[PDB]
Ligand binder design. Sequence first.
Ligand SMILES: Cn1cc(-c2cccc(C(F)(F)F)c2)c2sc(C(=N)NC3CCS(=O)(=O)CC3)cc2c1=O
Length: 127
Amino acid sequence: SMNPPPPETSNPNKPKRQTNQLQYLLRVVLKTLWKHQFAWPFQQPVDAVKLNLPDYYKIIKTPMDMGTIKKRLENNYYWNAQECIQDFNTMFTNCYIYNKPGDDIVLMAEALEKLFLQKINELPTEE
Ligand SMILES: Cn1cc(-c2cccc(C(F)(F)F)c2)c2sc(C(=N)NC3CCS(=O)(=O)CC3)cc2c1=O
């Protein structure tokens, strides 16, 4: 029933970089998804108390959300693009694991994921 602490967005000893791919992930990928009309359920960690989802964190053991990803990008938490791409994919997969096909939240995730896939297709080559 209770909420876990959110995923880490700061860790001083963790290796990190500012690469042109990571800059694209923030300026193009995150910003495109964040402004979408269906972004709002994904802009912060799932609040299992408020949403009355006492099973959520018993089923979803690797939670992820765009609020976390935004903070990780802004605070240069990542080493490479793949780490960030994996976070987006975790977020989508979590939604499909927890919910039913055709549920509103799944339809919203699908719409965001289509855009994500389009933008990652244009990920720039490493400089
Ligand atoms: C990632 N995520 C996010 C939400 C969510 C977050 C903030 C607000 C809201 C809300 F309620 F205001 F719309 C939803 C939710 S809500 C939800 C939910 N209640 N899912 C049920 C759908 C019907 S079911 O039979 O599949 C049981 C779970 C799942 C998720 C989610 O994964």
